[PDB]
Short mmCIF file of N, CA and C in Angstrom, two decimals:
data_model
loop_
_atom_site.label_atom_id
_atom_site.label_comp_id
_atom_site.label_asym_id
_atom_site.label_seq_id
_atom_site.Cartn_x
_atom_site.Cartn_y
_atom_site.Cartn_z
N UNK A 1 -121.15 88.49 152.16
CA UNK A 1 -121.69 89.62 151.37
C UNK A 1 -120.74 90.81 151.30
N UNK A 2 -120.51 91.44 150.17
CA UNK A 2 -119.69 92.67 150.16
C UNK A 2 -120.76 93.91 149.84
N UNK A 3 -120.52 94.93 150.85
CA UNK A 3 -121.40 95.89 150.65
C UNK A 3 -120.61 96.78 150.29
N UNK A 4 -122.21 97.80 149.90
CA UNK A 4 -122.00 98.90 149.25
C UNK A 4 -121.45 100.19 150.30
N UNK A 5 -120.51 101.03 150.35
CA UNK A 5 -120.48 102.00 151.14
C UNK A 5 -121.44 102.51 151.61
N UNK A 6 -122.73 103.20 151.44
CA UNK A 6 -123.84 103.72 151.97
C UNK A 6 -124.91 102.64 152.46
N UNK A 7 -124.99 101.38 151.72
CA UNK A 7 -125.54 100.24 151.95
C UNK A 7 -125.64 100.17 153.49
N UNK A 8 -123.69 99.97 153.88
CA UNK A 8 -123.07 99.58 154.90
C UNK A 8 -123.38 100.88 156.48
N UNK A 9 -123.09 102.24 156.03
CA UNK A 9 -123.37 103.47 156.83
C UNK A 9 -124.90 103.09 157.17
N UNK A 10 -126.04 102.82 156.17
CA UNK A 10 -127.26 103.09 156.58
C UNK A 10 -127.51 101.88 157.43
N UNK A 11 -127.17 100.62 157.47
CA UNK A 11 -126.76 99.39 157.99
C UNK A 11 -126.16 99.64 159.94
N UNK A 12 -125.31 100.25 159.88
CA UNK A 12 -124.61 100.81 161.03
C UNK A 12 -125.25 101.78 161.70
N UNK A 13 -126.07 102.59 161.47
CA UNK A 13 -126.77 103.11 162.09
C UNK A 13 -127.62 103.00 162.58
N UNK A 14 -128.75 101.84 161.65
CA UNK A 14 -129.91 101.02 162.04
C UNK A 14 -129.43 100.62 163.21
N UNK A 15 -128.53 100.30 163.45
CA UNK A 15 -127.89 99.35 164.77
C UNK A 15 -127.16 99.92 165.77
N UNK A 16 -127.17 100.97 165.91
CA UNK A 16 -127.17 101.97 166.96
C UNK A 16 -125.28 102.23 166.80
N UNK A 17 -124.64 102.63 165.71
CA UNK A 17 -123.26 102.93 165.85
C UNK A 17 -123.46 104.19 165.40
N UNK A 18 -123.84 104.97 164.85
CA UNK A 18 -123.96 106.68 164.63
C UNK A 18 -122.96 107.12 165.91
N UNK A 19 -121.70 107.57 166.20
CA UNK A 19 -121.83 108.31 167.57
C UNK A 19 -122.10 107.47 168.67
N UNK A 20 -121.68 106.33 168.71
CA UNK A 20 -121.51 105.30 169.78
C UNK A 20 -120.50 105.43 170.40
N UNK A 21 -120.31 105.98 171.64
CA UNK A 21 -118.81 105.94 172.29
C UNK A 21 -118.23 107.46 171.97
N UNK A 22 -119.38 108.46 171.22
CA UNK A 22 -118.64 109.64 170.54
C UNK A 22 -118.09 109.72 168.92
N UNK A 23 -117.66 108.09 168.24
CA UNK A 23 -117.49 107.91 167.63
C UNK A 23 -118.46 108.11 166.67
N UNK A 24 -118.45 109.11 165.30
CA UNK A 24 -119.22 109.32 164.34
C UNK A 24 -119.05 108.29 163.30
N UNK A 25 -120.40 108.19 162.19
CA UNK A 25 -120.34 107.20 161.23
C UNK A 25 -119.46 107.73 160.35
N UNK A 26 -118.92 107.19 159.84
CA UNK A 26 -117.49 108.09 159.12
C UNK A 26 -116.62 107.50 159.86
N UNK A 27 -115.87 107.27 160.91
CA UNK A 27 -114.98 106.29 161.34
C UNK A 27 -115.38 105.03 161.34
N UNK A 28 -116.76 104.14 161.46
CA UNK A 28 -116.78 103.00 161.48
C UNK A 28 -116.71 102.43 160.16
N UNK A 29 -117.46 103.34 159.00
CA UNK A 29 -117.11 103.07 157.67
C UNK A 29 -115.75 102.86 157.18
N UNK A 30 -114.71 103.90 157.48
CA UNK A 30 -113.70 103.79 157.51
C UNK A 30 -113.20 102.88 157.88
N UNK A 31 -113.43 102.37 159.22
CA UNK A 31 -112.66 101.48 159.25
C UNK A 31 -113.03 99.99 159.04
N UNK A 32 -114.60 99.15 158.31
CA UNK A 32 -114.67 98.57 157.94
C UNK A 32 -114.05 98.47 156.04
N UNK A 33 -113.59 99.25 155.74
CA UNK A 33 -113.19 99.57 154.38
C UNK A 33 -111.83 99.25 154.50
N UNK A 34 -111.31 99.94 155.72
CA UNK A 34 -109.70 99.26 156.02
C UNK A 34 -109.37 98.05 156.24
N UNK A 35 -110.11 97.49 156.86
CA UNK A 35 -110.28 95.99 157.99
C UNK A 35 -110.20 94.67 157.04
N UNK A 36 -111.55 94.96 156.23
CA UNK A 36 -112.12 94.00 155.28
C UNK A 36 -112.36 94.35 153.83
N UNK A 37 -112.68 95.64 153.62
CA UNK A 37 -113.13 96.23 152.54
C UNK A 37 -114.57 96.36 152.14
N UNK A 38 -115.02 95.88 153.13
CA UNK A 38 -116.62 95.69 153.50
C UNK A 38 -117.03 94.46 153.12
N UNK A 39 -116.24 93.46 153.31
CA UNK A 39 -116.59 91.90 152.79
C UNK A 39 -116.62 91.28 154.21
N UNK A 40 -118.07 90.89 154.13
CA UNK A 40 -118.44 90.13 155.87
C UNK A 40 -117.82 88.36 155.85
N UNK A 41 -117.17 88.19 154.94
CA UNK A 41 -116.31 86.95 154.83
C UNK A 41 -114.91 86.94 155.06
N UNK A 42 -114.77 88.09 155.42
CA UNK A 42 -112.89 88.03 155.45
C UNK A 42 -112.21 87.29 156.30
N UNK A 43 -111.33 87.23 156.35
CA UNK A 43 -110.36 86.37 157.83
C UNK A 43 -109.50 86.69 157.63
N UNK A 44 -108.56 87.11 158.75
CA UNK A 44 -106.99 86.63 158.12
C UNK A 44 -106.15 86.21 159.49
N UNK A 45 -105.47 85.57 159.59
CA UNK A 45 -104.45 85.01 160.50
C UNK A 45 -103.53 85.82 160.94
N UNK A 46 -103.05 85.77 162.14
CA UNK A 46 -102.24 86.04 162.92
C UNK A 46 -101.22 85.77 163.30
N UNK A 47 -99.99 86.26 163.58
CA UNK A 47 -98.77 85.61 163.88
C UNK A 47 -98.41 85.09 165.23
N UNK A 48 -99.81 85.45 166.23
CA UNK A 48 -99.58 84.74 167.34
C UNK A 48 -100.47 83.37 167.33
N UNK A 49 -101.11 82.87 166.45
CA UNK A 49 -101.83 81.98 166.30
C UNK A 49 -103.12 82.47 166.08
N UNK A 50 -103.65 83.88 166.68
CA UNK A 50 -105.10 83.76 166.36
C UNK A 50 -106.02 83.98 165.08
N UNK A 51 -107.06 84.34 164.85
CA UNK A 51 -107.87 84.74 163.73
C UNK A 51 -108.71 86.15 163.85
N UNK A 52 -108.61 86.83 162.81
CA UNK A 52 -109.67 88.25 162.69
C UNK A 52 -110.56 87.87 161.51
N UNK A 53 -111.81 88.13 162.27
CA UNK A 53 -113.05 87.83 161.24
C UNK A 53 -114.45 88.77 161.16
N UNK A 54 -114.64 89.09 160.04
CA UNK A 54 -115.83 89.71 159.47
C UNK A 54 -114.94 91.30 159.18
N UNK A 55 -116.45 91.87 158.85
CA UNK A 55 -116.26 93.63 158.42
C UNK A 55 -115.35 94.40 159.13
N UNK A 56 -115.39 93.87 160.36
CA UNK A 56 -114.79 94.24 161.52
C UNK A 56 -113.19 93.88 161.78
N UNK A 57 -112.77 92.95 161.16
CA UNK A 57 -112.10 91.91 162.02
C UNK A 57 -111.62 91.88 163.30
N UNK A 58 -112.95 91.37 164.15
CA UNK A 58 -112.37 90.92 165.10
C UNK A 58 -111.96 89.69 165.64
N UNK A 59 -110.95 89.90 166.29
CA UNK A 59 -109.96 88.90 167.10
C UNK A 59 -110.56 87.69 167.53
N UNK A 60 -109.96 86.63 167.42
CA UNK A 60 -110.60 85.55 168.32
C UNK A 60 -109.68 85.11 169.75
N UNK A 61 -108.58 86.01 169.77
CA UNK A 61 -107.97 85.72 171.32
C UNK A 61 -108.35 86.30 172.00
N UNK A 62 -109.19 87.58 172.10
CA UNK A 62 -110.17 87.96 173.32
C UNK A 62 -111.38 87.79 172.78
N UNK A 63 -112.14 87.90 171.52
CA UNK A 63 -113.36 88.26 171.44
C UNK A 63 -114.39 87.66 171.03
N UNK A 64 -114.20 86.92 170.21
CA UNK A 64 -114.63 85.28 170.03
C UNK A 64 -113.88 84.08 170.28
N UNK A 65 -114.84 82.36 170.22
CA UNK A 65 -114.52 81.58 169.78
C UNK A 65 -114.35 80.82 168.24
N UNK A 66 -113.40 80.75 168.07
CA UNK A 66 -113.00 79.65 166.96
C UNK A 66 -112.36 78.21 166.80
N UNK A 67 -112.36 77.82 168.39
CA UNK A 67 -111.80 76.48 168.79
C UNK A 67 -110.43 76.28 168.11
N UNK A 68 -109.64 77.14 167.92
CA UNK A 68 -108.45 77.54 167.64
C UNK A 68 -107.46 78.03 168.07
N UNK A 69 -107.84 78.71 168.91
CA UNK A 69 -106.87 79.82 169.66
C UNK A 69 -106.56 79.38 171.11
N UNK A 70 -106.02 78.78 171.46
CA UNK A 70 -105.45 78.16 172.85
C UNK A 70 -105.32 79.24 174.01
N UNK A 71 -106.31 79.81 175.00
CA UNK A 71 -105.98 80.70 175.75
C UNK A 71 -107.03 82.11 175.59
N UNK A 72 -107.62 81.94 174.62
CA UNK A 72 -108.41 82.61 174.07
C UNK A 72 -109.73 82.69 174.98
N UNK A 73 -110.29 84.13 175.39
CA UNK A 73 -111.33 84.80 176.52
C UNK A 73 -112.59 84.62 175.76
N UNK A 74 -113.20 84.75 174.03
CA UNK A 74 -114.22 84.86 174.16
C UNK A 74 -115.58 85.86 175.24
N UNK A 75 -114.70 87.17 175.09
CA UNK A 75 -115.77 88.11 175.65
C UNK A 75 -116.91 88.34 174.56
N UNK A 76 -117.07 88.55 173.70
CA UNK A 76 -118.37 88.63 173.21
C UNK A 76 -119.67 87.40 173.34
N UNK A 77 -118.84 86.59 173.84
CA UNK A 77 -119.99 84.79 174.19
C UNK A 77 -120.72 84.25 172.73
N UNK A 78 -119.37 84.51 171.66
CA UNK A 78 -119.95 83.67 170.23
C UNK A 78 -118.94 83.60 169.92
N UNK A 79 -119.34 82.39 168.38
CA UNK A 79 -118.39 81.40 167.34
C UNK A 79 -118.03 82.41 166.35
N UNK A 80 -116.99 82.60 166.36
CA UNK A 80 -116.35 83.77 165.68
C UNK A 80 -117.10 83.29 163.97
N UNK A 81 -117.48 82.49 163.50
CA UNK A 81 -118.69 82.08 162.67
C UNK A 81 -119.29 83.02 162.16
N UNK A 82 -119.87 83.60 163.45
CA UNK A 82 -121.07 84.11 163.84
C UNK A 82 -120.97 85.65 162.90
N UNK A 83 -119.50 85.62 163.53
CA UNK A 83 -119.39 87.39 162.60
C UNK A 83 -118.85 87.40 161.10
N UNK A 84 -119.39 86.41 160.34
CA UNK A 84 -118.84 86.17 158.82
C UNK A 84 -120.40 85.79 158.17
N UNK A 85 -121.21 86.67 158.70
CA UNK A 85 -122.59 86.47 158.22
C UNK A 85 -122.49 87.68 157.49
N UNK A 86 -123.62 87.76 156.43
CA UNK A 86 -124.01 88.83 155.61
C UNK A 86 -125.32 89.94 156.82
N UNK A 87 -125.37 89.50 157.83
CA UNK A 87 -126.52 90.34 158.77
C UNK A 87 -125.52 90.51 159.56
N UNK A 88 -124.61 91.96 159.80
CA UNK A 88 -124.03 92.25 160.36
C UNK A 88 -124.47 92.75 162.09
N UNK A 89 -125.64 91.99 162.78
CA UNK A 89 -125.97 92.09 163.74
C UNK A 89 -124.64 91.86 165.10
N UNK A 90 -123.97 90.76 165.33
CA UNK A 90 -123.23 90.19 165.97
C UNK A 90 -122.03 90.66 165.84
N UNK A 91 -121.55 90.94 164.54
CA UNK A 91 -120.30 92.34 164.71
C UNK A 91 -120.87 93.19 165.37
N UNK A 92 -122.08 93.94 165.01
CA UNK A 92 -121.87 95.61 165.44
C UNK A 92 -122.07 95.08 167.17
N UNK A 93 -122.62 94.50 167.57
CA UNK A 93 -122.55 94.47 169.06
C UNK A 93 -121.84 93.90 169.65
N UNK A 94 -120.58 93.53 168.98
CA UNK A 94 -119.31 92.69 169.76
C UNK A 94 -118.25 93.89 169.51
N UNK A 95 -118.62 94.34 168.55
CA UNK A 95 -117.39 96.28 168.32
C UNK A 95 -118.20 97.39 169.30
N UNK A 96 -119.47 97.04 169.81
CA UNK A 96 -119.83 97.73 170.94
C UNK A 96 -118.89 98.04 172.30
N UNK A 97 -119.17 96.53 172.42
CA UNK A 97 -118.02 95.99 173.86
C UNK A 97 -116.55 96.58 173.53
N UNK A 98 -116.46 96.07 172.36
CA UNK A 98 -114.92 96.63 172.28
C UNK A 98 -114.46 97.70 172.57
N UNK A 99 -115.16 98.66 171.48
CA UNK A 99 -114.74 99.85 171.81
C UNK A 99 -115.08 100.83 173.12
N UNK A 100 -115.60 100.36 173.68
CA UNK A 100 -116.47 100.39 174.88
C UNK A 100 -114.70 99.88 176.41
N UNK A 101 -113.78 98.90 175.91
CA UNK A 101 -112.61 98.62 176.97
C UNK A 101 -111.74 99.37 177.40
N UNK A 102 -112.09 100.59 177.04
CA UNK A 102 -110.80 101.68 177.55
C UNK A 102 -110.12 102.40 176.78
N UNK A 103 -109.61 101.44 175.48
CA UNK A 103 -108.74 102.33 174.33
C UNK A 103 -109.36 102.67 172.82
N UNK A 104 -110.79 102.57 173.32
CA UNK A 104 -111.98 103.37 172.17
C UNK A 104 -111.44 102.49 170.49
N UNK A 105 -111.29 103.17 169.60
CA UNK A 105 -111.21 102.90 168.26
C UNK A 105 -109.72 102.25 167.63
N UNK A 106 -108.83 102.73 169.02
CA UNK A 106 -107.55 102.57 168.71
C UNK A 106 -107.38 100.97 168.81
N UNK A 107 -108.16 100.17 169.49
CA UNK A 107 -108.17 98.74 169.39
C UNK A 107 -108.25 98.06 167.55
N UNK A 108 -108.67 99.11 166.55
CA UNK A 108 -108.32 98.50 165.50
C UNK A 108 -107.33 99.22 164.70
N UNK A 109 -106.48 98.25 164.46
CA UNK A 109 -105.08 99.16 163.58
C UNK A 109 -104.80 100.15 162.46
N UNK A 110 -105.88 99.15 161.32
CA UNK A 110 -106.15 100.23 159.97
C UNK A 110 -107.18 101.33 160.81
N UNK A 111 -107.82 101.28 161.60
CA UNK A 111 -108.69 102.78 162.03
C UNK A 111 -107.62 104.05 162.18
N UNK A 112 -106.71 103.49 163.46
CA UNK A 112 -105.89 104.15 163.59
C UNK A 112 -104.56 104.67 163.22
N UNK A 113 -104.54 103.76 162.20
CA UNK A 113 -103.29 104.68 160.83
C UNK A 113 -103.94 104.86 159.64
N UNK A 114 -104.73 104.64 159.11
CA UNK A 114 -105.49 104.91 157.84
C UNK A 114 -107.11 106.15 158.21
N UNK A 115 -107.60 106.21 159.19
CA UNK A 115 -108.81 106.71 159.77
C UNK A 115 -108.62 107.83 160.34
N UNK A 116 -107.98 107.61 161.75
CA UNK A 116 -107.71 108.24 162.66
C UNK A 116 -107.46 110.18 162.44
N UNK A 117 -108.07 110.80 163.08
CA UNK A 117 -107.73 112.13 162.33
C UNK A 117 -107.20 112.42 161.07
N UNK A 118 -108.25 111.90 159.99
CA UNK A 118 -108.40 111.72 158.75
C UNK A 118 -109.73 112.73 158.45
N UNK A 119 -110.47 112.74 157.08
CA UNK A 119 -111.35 113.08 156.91
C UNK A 119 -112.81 112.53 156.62
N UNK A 120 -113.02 111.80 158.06
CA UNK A 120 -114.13 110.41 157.70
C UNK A 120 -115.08 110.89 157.84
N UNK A 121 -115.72 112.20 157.16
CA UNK A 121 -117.06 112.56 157.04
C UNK A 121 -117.72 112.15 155.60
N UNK A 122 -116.25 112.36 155.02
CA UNK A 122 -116.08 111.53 153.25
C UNK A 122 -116.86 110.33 152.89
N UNK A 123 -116.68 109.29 154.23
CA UNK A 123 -117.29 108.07 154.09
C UNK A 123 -118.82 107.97 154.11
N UNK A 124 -119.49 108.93 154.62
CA UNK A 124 -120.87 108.67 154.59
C UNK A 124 -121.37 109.84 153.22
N UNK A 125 -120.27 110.76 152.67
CA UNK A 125 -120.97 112.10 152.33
C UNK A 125 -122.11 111.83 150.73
N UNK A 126 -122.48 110.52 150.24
CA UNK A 126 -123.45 110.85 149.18
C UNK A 126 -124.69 110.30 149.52
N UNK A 127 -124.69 109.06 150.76
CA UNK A 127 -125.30 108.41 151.25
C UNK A 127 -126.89 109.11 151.57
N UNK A 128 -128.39 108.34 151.72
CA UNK A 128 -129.32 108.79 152.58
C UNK A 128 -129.75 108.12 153.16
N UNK A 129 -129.09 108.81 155.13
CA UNK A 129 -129.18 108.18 156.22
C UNK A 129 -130.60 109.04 156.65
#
């Protein structure tokens, strides 16, 4: 499913990311717009072998399985599958954990060169949350 920007904010909040970690809605928008473009089907490959998948893309060498990745932790305890659904339940609580390991938001790349002390109040501003 590809969502709508406000679609996606009112979506993320239902699910407890508003200010999760400190982090306001306006960076997670952001950075699902960077990541994927808000398409819960994305993937893309890696040059160390692994895979990034969904809105999110997250990793499958720590964070899911994809029976792909040789060495691969699977901390979230799902089929990286799982996060290429149109019910973005299983992303938002596997970007919980994440951002939750120590290095907050900076664990995703477009957040932190495209996002990052940017003006991501923009991303939610026509929306009704």
């Amino acid at each position: 499913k590809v969502f709508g920007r406000c679609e996606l904010a009112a979506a993320m909040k239902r699910h407890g990311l508003d200010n999760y970690r400190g982090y306001s809605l306006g960076n997670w928008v952001c950075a699902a717009k960077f990541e994927s473009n808000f398409n819960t089907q994305a993937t893309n490959r890696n040059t160390d072998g692994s895979t990034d998948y969904g809105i999110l893309q997250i990793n499958s060498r720590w964070w899911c399985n994809d029976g792909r990745t040789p060495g691969s932790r699977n901390l979230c305890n799902i089929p990286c599958s799982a996060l290429l659904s149109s019910d973005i339940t299983a992303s938002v609580n596997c970007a919980k954990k994440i951002v939750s390991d120590g290095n907050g938001m900076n664990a995703w790349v477009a957040w932190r060169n495209r996002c990052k002390g940017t003006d991501v109040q923009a991303w939610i501003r026509g929306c009704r949350l």
